[PDB]
C-alpha cells in the first residue's frame, strides 16, 4: 500500500465535475476546484488546469496526472511548513503517509493548526493523539475516512485500508 493507494481509496475518482463533502466542485481524486457557487467558475478553473476546453469532463489519465501534482504539493507543502516538518521528519513511513492524507484533504493550515496533536504525534503518544484527533470537526464530519486515518498514526500499519 502506499500514499496514492491510499488516497484513491478515501477519494474515489470522478471524470466528471461533482461536490465533495463540504459541497464545493471537484473532479478527478479530490481535486477541489474551487469554493465557488459557480459552476462555470469551475469549469473555467478546471480547463485552465488541464490545458484544454473539457467541458466538465476528463479522461483517467488527465485525472491521475493532476493527482501526481496534488501529492506532491501536499508533500511539498508539509516540508515548507515549520510546524508540519518537524512532525513529518520525526515519523516513520506509514504514518507519514497519514499525516499527507490530512494535509491533502485539508490544507497545510488546517493541519498545522491541530496542534496539540501534532506535538503528541512528535513525542510518539500514539494513543493520546489518537484521542486527541478525533475531537475535531474533520472527524465529526467525515468520521469514516477521519478513522482509517487515526488508526493509522495509532498503529503505524495499513490494517485500515486493509
Ligand atoms: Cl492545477
Ligand atoms: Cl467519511
Known amino acids: 500500500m502506499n500514499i496514492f493507494e ?3 481509496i478515501d477519494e474515489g475518482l470522478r471524470l466528471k465535475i461533482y461536490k465533495d463533502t463540504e459541497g464545493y466542485y471537484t473532479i478527478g481524486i479530490g481535486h477541489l476546484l474551487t469554493k465557488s457557487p459557480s459552476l462555470n467558475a469551475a469549469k473555467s478553473e478546471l480547463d485552465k488546469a488541464i490545458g484544454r476546453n473539457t467541458n466538465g469532463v476528463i479522461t483517467k489519465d488527465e485525472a491521475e496526472k493532476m493527482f501526481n501534482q496534488d501529492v506532491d504539493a ?10 508540519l516538518k ?5 515519523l516513520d513511513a506509514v504514518r507519514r503517509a497519514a499525516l499527507i492524507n490530512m494535509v ?4 497545510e493550515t488546517g493541519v498545522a ?3 496539540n496533536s501534532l506535538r503528541m504525534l512528535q513525542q510518539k503518544r500514539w494513543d493520546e493523539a489518537a484521542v486527541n484527533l478525533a475531537k475535531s470537526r474533520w472527524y465529526n464530519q467525515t468520521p469514516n475516512r477521519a478513522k482509517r486515518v487515526i488508526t493509522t498514526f495509532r498503529t503505524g500499519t495499513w490494517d485500515a485500508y486493509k
Open 6 to 8: 491510499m488516497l484513491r
Open 74 to 83: 501536499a508533500v511539498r507543502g508539509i516540508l515548507r511548513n515549520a510546524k
Open 86 to 90: 518537524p512532525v513529518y521528519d520525526s
Open 104 to 107: 491533502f484533504q485539508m490544507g
Open 113 to 115: 493548526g491541530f496542534t
